[PDB]
Design an enzyme around this catalytic site. Structure first.
Site, PDB file in Angstrom:
ATOM      1  N   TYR A  49      -7.259  -0.229   7.951  1.00  0.00           N
ATOM      2  CA  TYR A  49      -7.173  -0.097   6.519  1.00  0.00           C
ATOM      3  C   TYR A  49      -8.142   0.984   6.071  1.00  0.00           C
ATOM      4  CZ  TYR A  49      -7.894  -1.322   1.605  1.00  0.00           C
ATOM      5  OH  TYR A  49      -8.012  -1.287   0.243  1.00  0.00           O
ATOM      6  N   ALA A  50      -7.661   1.880   5.227  1.00  0.00           N
ATOM      7  CA  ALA A  50      -8.469   2.934   4.647  1.00  0.00           C
ATOM      8  C   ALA A  50      -8.487   2.691   3.140  1.00  0.00           C
ATOM      9  CB  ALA A  50      -7.846   4.279   4.974  1.00  0.00           C
ATOM     10  N   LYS A  95       2.040  -2.827   9.117  1.00  0.00           N
ATOM     11  CA  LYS A  95       3.328  -2.125   9.087  1.00  0.00           C
ATOM     12  C   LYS A  95       4.430  -3.091   9.462  1.00  0.00           C
ATOM     13  CE  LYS A  95       2.717   2.741  10.104  1.00  0.00           C
ATOM     14  NZ  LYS A  95       4.117   3.212   9.892  1.00  0.00           N
ATOM     15  N   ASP A 124      -0.301   8.230  11.282  1.00  0.00           N
ATOM     16  CA  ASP A 124       1.102   8.486  11.595  1.00  0.00           C
ATOM     17  C   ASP A 124       1.321   9.533  12.707  1.00  0.00           C
ATOM     18  OD1 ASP A 124       1.934   6.450   9.854  1.00  0.00           O
ATOM     19  OD2 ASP A 124       2.531   7.800   8.247  1.00  0.00           O
ATOM     20  N   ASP A 160       3.316  16.435  11.784  1.00  0.00           N
ATOM     21  CA  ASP A 160       3.263  16.336  10.313  1.00  0.00           C
ATOM     22  C   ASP A 160       1.833  16.274   9.804  1.00  0.00           C
ATOM     23  OD1 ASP A 160       4.169  16.190   7.667  1.00  0.00           O
ATOM     24  OD2 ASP A 160       4.644  14.044   7.780  1.00  0.00           O
ATOM     25  N   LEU A 214       0.824  -1.216   0.000  1.00  0.00           N
ATOM     26  CA  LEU A 214       0.000   0.000   0.000  1.00  0.00           C
ATOM     27  C   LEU A 214       0.858   1.267   0.000  1.00  0.00           C
ATOM     28  CD1 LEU A 214      -2.626  -0.988   2.715  1.00  0.00           C
ATOM     29  CD2 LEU A 214      -3.046  -0.899   0.243  1.00  0.00           C
ATOM     30  N   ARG A 256      -1.908  14.456   3.176  1.00  0.00           N
ATOM     31  CA  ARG A 256      -1.231  13.198   2.870  1.00  0.00           C
ATOM     32  C   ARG A 256      -1.269  12.210   4.042  1.00  0.00           C
ATOM     33  NH1 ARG A 256       2.631  17.175   2.879  1.00  0.00           N
ATOM     34  NH2 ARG A 256       3.905  17.248   4.775  1.00  0.00           N
ATOM     35  N   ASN A 257      -1.362  12.721   5.276  1.00  0.00           N
ATOM     36  CA  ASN A 257      -1.430  11.870   6.468  1.00  0.00           C
ATOM     37  C   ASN A 257      -2.835  11.732   7.039  1.00  0.00           C
ATOM     38  OD1 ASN A 257       1.307  11.250   6.492  1.00  0.00           O
ATOM     39  ND2 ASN A 257       1.838  13.125   7.596  1.00  0.00           N
ATOM     40  N   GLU A 270       5.290   2.700   0.834  1.00  0.00           N
ATOM     41  CA  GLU A 270       6.694   2.431   1.170  1.00  0.00           C
ATOM     42  C   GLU A 270       7.472   3.743   1.256  1.00  0.00           C
ATOM     43  OE1 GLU A 270       8.551  -0.616  -1.236  1.00  0.00           O
ATOM     44  OE2 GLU A 270       6.608  -1.475  -1.822  1.00  0.00           O
TER      45      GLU A 270
HETATM   46  C1  LIG Z   1      -9.236   1.934  -5.344  1.00  0.00           C
HETATM   47  N1  LIG Z   1      -8.278   2.201  -4.257  1.00  0.00           N
HETATM   48  C2  LIG Z   1      -7.649   3.510  -4.452  1.00  0.00           C
HETATM   49  C3  LIG Z   1      -6.957   3.910  -3.155  1.00  0.00           C
HETATM   50  N2  LIG Z   1      -6.079   2.818  -2.750  1.00  0.00           N
HETATM   51  C4  LIG Z   1      -5.232   2.964  -1.642  1.00  0.00           C
HETATM   52  C5  LIG Z   1      -3.931   3.369  -1.934  1.00  0.00           C
HETATM   53  C6  LIG Z   1      -2.995   3.536  -0.929  1.00  0.00           C
HETATM   54  C7  LIG Z   1      -3.358   3.280   0.385  1.00  0.00           C
HETATM   55  N3  LIG Z   1      -2.676   3.349   1.528  1.00  0.00           N
HETATM   56  C8  LIG Z   1      -3.505   2.979   2.511  1.00  0.00           C
HETATM   57  C9  LIG Z   1      -3.186   2.945   3.966  1.00  0.00           C
HETATM   58  C10 LIG Z   1      -1.901   3.521   4.452  1.00  0.00           C
HETATM   59  N4  LIG Z   1      -0.982   4.063   3.605  1.00  0.00           N
HETATM   60  C11 LIG Z   1      -1.656   3.485   5.919  1.00  0.00           C
HETATM   61  C12 LIG Z   1      -0.429   4.022   6.554  1.00  0.00           C
HETATM   62  F1  LIG Z   1       0.524   4.586   5.786  1.00  0.00           F
HETATM   63  C13 LIG Z   1      -0.292   3.947   7.948  1.00  0.00           C
HETATM   64  C14 LIG Z   1      -1.288   3.370   8.733  1.00  0.00           C
HETATM   65  C15 LIG Z   1      -2.459   2.845   8.180  1.00  0.00           C
HETATM   66  C16 LIG Z   1      -2.684   2.877   6.802  1.00  0.00           C
HETATM   67  N5  LIG Z   1      -3.815   2.385   6.283  1.00  0.00           N
HETATM   68  C17 LIG Z   1      -4.110   2.375   4.969  1.00  0.00           C
HETATM   69  O1  LIG Z   1      -5.200   1.887   4.589  1.00  0.00           O
HETATM   70  N6  LIG Z   1      -4.759   2.700   2.082  1.00  0.00           N
HETATM   71  C18 LIG Z   1      -4.734   2.844   0.733  1.00  0.00           C
HETATM   72  C19 LIG Z   1      -5.642   2.692  -0.322  1.00  0.00           C
HETATM   73  C20 LIG Z   1      -5.965   1.551  -3.492  1.00  0.00           C
HETATM   74  C21 LIG Z   1      -7.242   1.155  -4.247  1.00  0.00           C
HETATM   75 CL   LIG Z   2       1.497  16.395  -0.057  1.00  0.00          CL
END
Ligand SMILES: CN1CCN(c2ccc3[nH]c(-c4c(N)c5c(F)cccc5[nH]c4=O)nc3c2)CC1
Ligand SMILES: [Cl-]
Ligand SMILES: [Cl-]
Ligand SMILES: [Cl-]
Length: 295
Positions: free
Chosen positions: A104-105, A55, A171, A153, A28, A157-158, A30
């Site tokens: 999960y978001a 994570k 975060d 931060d 998701l 983006r966060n 990196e």
């Molecule tokens: C159709 N869709 C578009 C949006 N799409 C997506 C793309 C990136 C994504 N990252 C996270 C996510 C985190 N990056 C994250 C974190 F960095 C720390 C703690 C919890 C986190 N939970 C997340 O759920 N969800 C995402 C969904 C994929 C498919």
């Molecule tokens: Cl940004």
């Protein structure tokens, strides 16, 4: 020793999930953050799978990287749950690499979410929707502030967006050495994090709830420009000169005078004079109710 730790992690039964209950999926972010399915997260419902984010460290990582991931997990335990933050759900700490399981978001970060929904040059957002998004972020921050957590931060983006369009602050528990932060280093999207920082955090490295409110001001600006880039084209040195002169970003087109005054209040030069997240939640609640969704 490869990915094996020199120390060993203490067991914590409050949060431990067996490794075999976690079906690991695609990356998701990196690193690293991966989508997984958790079987029987809730011990009441052992036959259910829940989509979760996991994570973990990369093969490169040092003991310090591990220490930082443990620290984030421990701070998340202490902070407790709220609807508008990314919550800790569990961990795998034993007999293998550390996994920290969090919410999960499915719609990803708020910057992309907003940009995808600009009118074409994807369903558009009403004024009420944008203000409700601000409301939820402010509520998350009010919770975090009440728990004495300074984010450092805060930015679109966060903030992550769930399948039901719930805004969740991410975060907030990261260990950061603010002395070591590269003012010239950029986000993967190519924008400079210094553009969200209060002058006192930027110049004197003093981080407070009040500096987070400054960042929330910039985040409001991001929301009402539908994911706009703050101070576009401005390099670090010129940003410093703009802030010393008392420059403030222009009012976005799709935005009321009241919401712009809220942004400007968040960017008060004197930190004590900025509104608190508590007050912001209160003001945004009133505005949500009074703002048209068109119909
Ligand atoms: C159709 N869709 C578009 C949006 N799409 C997506 C793309 C990136 C994504 N990252 C996270 C996510 C985190 N990056 C994250 C974190 F960095 C720390 C703690 C919890 C986190 N939970 C997340 O759920 N969800 C995402 C969904 C994929 C498919
Ligand atoms: Cl940004
Ligand atoms: Cl290690
Ligand atoms: Cl709780």
């Amino acid at each position: 020793v490869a990915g094996v730790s020199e120390y060993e992690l203490p067991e914590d039964p409050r949060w431990e999930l067996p490794r075999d209950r976690l079906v690991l999926g695609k990356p998701l972010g990196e690193g690293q953050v991966v989508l997984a399915e958790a079987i029987g997260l809730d011990k009441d419902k052992p036959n259910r799978v829940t989509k979760v984010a996991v994570k973990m460290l990369k093969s490169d990582a040092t003991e310090k990287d591990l220490s930082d991931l443990i620290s984030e997990m421990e701070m998340m335990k202490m902070i407790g749950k709220h609807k508008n933050i990314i919550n800790l759900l569990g961990a795998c700490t034993q007999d293998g690499p550390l996994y920290v399981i969090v919410e999960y978001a499915s719609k990803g970060n708020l910057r992309e979410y907003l940009q995808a929904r600009r009118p074409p040059g994807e369903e558009q957002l009403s004024s009420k929707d944008l203000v409700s998004c601000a409301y939820q972020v402010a509520r998350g921050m009010e919770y975090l502030a009440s728990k004495k957590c300074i984010h450092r931060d805060l930015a679109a983006r966060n903030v992550l967006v769930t399948e039901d369009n719930v805004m969740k602050i991410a975060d907030f528990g990261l260990a950061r050495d603010i002395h070591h932060i590269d003012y010239y280093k950029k986000t993967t999207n190519g924008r400079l994090p210094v553009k969200w920082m209060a002058p006192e955090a930027l110049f004197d490295r003093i981080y407070t709830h009040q500096s987070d409110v400054w960042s929330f001001g910039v985040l409001l600006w991001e929301i009402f420009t539908l994911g706009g880039s703050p101070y576009p084209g401005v390099p670090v040195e010129e940003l410093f000169k703009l802030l010393k002169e008392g420059h403030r970003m222009d009012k976005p087109s799709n935005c009321t005078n009241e919401l712009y005054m809220m942004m400007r209040d968040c960017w008060h030069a004197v930190p004590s004079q900025r509104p608190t997240f508590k007050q912001l939640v209160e003001d945004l609640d009133r505005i949500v109710a009074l703002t048209s969704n068109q119909e």
